[PDB]
Amino acid sequence: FQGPMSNDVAELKQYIDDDGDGPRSWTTQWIRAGEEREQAGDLLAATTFYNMARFPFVDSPGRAEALRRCVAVFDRWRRTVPGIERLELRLPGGVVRAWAAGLSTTERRPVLLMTGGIVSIKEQWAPILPELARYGFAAVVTEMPGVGENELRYDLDSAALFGVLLDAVAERADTSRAYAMALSFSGHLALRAAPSEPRLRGIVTAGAPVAAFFTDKEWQAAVPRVTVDTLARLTQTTPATVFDHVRNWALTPQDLAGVRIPVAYVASGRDEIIPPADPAMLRTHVRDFRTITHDDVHGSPAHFPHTRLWTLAQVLEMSGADPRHRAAVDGAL
Known part of the structure; x- marks a missing residue:
């Protein structure tokens, strides 16, 4: 088809x-x-x-x-906008583009890696690059395999993407200290990467799938068609085969026990895409886990102000940001 x-x-x-x-x-x-x-x-x-x-x-x-x-x-x-730069990575599996700000050979700044889920292109987030750099980061916003300009196939090795972004800016940022703001499905990739990627020092996500998404068949049968069809496009499979295709992508109790960095997660109480068992599982097994749940549908679209502030507050804490900046965000939060 x-x-x-x-x-x-x-x-x-x-x-x-x-x-x-x-x-x-x-x-x-x-x-x-x-x-x-x-x-x-x-x-x-x-x-x-x-x-x-x-x-x-x-x-x-x-x-x-x-x-x-x-x-x-x-x-x-x-x-x-001075400071916003395009990065293009010509990779084995295809080309990946990114937008960045706050890069520097003279100051070594911590990296903020930002990605959305399976429908979010990087231009959704890129306009806030200058404000993220203003918090002291080298900020790099990209998009998932198959999304926007990212040419790669979303497959079992896709978790390598974060390390490859850090490789590309290693001369221009403190790439030993990276924080992934990896929303939705990309959050699953971050959590899968973390145990073998010591550069990742923390993860902030919202609605990331974990285990049950990949293995619970009754739940899969009720997931909106737009989610299924997209997943099939990104993985380059079909709707009949896509869930079988991603069955062994589940994060196990040991995978999660292997994540030794702070992890923050915004859960949507009435999420249609992500089963309640997935954040429950993270609450059971991730050692350093911070979370909030909005009584809202997928993406918590009625609490964007709150979500943007909470997530922000979390990444500033994890990276030891200026206390003046933390207290202003804490007040707003």
């Missing part, structure tokens, strides 16, 4: 009549909205709108166009 997904539209909107390619389609409408903001010179709003157009993943000429326009308008915006 090669064509477009024809995503269920109720469900794209939860995150325009249809998911086709006509004048009332999802992609066309988001592109037109994007084009209007771009013409008014509001490049960050255009970035968001082209981003939405390509959501959940590029499966058509129109989504491929939208992704390119997103990257381009963002590139144009960041060109006004």
